């Protein structure tokens, strides 16, 4: 009776409403319309949905986890805004409509990215209710989100993505993609009341579906600046890439043995969806 | 007797050692060299020192506030790195040295600023001692620093400044002027004093008086350097020159009045800093 598609839609639209209430437009406007433009451009919202999922699985409520979920989608948005800039990437179109700096300028773009990054923390720290989550856990959460974006996560992956073999590729993907996914699963588990063991199993899970996205997207492109030429089928061959993708989907499904029964359904569905898209 | 310069030199030197140790050269290296380059290029280090001062005044220990101080100076560094970008007030030279985006790419500059901003929070949350400072206070701190950087602080100031728009007519543009300086300079001064107070164990009342103190010397920096430059948008031309001198001495008074009630020997550095900023030639 479980519908993955119905799940993903109600969760995403719930998240979108939260993002709208969290960054209203006011005060100095150009900056807020700049933030809102990129932040409320919709999306699959996979990172916040994964964070709400991880919270529900360990027993927390959908609402406890909302500000954490908003925080990781703000980090995600900021990483894209600073990507599209001319010094890097230099793309004028994202999802059809033009990029943030092509509408407001590279100046307001850099600044809007910084504002989203800092508001992420302000929101995770202030809006997480003091009546459900102990300060200890909010502190641990902040530390994890920050670790995830810095030089052991998102930023390390972006720098290296500019300048030969397998661990170079895996490096870029563990930091650019998997680090913030890990942060999403782990934050959900933390503020949702999860135990240390549960938090480590959700970290491993997120790391696995984070690589899986990438191996599968590289396989799909041949079956129809550095991470474009360098693909898993080029390095491993196509068969070894497919075996790799099923080792990863397996390990992801096995981290979820041990949670019981009910709230594993969405995460299992997510894993299979990423694994077997066509 | 109390020696102000001896104080500021031992304190800055202490901060410098703290920052070198918090951002070592690890991998990947080019980014760590980009961060280190701007973070350890020396400087007066007034914000972290203000934060340490504020911690000691409310009863806390010097070492307690050290990660908070490193956080505010990292944030400050990012604000300089992103100030210099070509899209933003392009500056080929910072200090006397070439700018961060002129040594590494502009891309590595943007990313280094992002790594510094994030490490501020990682370091403030992770490295702050869990048995001297309660998590409740660490949470409040994360919030004050974040608020300080955002659109109610630093970034609101850098936008209304390089972005639209103000009227510089005297005496109309007066509240435009205050706005730019309350956000571009004083927001982060307020955060460092407040961080210092929060983490030193100070009460909700100490904290608001040190917040006002910091707001006053933050405005004071600006009024005084504008007064010295007459010896686009400035205090003597919007308000001054005489009304500016009285404004600067009102600000010095009020800053000195925020310190009554503390015990009179750990106020000496803050008083000295105030009088120093206030009186130049």
UniProtKB/Swiss-Prot annotation, chain A:
Catalytic activity line of the entry: isopentenyl diphosphate + dimethylallyl diphosphate = (2E)-geranyl diphosphate + diphosphate; isopentenyl diphosphate + (2E)-geranyl diphosphate = (2E,6E)-farnesyl diphosphate + diphosphate; isopentenyl diphosphate + (2E,6E)-farnesyl diphosphate = (2E,6E,10E)-geranylgeranyl diphosphate + diphosphate
Cofactor annotation comment: Binds 2 Mg(2+) ions per subunit.
Major enzyme class: transferase
Enzyme Commission code(s) on record: 2.5.1.-, 2.5.1.1, 2.5.1.29, 2.5.1.10
One GO biological process term: embryo development ending in seed dormancy
GO MF assignments: (2E,6E)-farnesyl diphosphate synthase activity; dimethylallyltranstransferase activity; geranylgeranyl diphosphate synthase activity; metal ion binding
Amino-acid biosynthesis among keywords: no
Tissues where this protein is expressed: Expressed ubiquitously.
GO cellular component, one term: cytosol
Annotated positions binding isopentenyl diphosphate: 44, 47, 76, 95
Keywords assigned by UniProt, alphabetized: Acetylation, Carotenoid biosynthesis, Chloroplast, Cytoplasm, Isoprene biosynthesis, Magnesium, Metal-binding, Plastid, Transferase, Transit peptide
Residues annotated to bind Mg(2+) 1: 83, 89
Pathways involved: Isoprenoid biosynthesis; farnesyl diphosphate biosynthesis; farnesyl diphosphate from geranyl diphosphate and isopentenyl diphosphate: step 1/1; Isoprenoid biosynthesis; geranyl diphosphate biosynthesis; geranyl diphosphate from dimethylallyl diphosphate and isopentenyl diphosphate: step 1/1; Isoprenoid biosynthesis; geranylgeranyl diphosphate biosynthesis; geranylgeranyl diphosphate from farnesyl diphosphate and isopentenyl diphosphate: step 1/1
Binding site for Mg(2+) 2: 83, 89
Keyword Magnesium: yes
Names of required cofactors: Mg(2+)
Residues binding dimethylallyl diphosphate, per UniProt: 94, 176-177, 214, 229
Quaternary structure, from the entry: Forms homodimers. Part of a heterodimeric geranyl(geranyl)diphosphate synthase. Interacts with GGR.
Function (record text): Heterodimeric geranyl(geranyl)-diphosphate (GPP) synthase large subunit. In vitro, the large subunit catalyzes mainly the trans-addition of the three molecules of IPP onto DMAPP to form geranylgeranyl pyrophosphate while the small subunit alone is inactive. Upon association of the two subunits, the product profile changes and the production of gerany-diphosphate is strongly increased.
Family: Belongs to the FPP/GGPP synthase family.
Protein name per the record: Heterodimeric geranylgeranyl pyrophosphate synthase large subunit 1, chloroplastic
UniProtKB/Swiss-Prot annotation, chain B:
Any GO BP annotation: carotenoid biosynthetic process
GO CC annotations, alphabetized: chloroplast; cytosol; etioplast; plastid
Binding site for Mg(2+) 2: 83, 89
Signal peptide segment: none
Sorted UniProt keywords: Acetylation, Carotenoid biosynthesis, Chloroplast, Cytoplasm, Isoprene biosynthesis, Magnesium, Metal-binding, Plastid, Transferase, Transit peptide
Top-rank EC class of the record's enzyme: transferase
Reactions catalysed, as given in the entry: isopentenyl diphosphate + dimethylallyl diphosphate = (2E)-geranyl diphosphate + diphosphate; isopentenyl diphosphate + (2E)-geranyl diphosphate = (2E,6E)-farnesyl diphosphate + diphosphate; isopentenyl diphosphate + (2E,6E)-farnesyl diphosphate = (2E,6E,10E)-geranylgeranyl diphosphate + diphosphate
Any GO MF annotation of the entry: dimethylallyltranstransferase activity
Cofactor: Mg(2+)
Tissue specificity of this protein: Expressed ubiquitously.
Annotated residues for binding of isopentenyl diphosphate: 44, 47, 76, 95
Cofactor note: Binds 2 Mg(2+) ions per subunit.
Pathway(s) annotated for this protein in UniProt: Isoprenoid biosynthesis; farnesyl diphosphate biosynthesis; farnesyl diphosphate from geranyl diphosphate and isopentenyl diphosphate: step 1/1; Isoprenoid biosynthesis; geranyl diphosphate biosynthesis; geranyl diphosphate from dimethylallyl diphosphate and isopentenyl diphosphate: step 1/1; Isoprenoid biosynthesis; geranylgeranyl diphosphate biosynthesis; geranylgeranyl diphosphate from farnesyl diphosphate and isopentenyl diphosphate: step 1/1
The family this protein is said to belong to: Belongs to the FPP/GGPP synthase family.
Subunit (UniProt): Forms homodimers. Part of a heterodimeric geranyl(geranyl)diphosphate synthase. Interacts with GGR.
Identification of the protein by name: Heterodimeric geranylgeranyl pyrophosphate synthase large subunit 1, chloroplastic
Gene: GGPPS1
Section covered of the full-length record: 73 to 370 of 371
């Amino acid at each position: 009776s479980f519908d993955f598609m119905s799940y993903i839609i109600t969760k995403a639209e719930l998240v979108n409403k939260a993002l709208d209430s969290a960054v209203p437009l006011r005060e100095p406007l150009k900056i807020h319309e700049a933030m809102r433009y990129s932040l409320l451009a919709g999306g699959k919202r996979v990172r916040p949905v994964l964070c709400i999922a991880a919270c529900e699985l360990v027993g927390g409520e959908e609402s406890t986890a909302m500000p954490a979920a908003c925080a990781v989608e703000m980090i995600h948005t900021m990483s894209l805004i600073h990507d599209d800039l001319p010094c890097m990437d230099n793309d004028d179109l994202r999802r059809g409509k033009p990029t943030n700096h092509k509408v407001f300028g590279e100046d307001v773009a850099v600044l809007a990215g910084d504002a989203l990054l800092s508001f992420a923390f302000e929101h995770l720290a202030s809006a997480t209710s003091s009546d459900v989550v102990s300060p200890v856990r909010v502190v641990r959460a902040v530390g994890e989100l920050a670790k995830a974006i810095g030089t052991e996560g998102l930023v390390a992956g972006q720098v290296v993505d500019i300048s030969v073999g397998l661990e170079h590729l895996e490096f870029i993907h563990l930091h650019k993609t998997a680090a913030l996914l890990e942060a999403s699963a782990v934050l959900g588990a933390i503020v949702g009341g999860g135990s240390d063991d549960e938090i480590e199993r959700l970290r491993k899970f997120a790391r696995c579906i984070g690589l899986l996205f990438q191996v599968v997207d590289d396989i799909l492109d041949v079956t129809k600046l550095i991470a474009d030429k360098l693909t898993y089928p080029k390095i491993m061959g196509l068969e070894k890439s497919r075996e790799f993708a099923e080792k990863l989907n397996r390990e992801a499904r096995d981290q979820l043995l041990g949670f019981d029964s009910d709230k594993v359904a969405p995460l299992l569905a997510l894993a299979n969806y990423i694994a077997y898209r066509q």
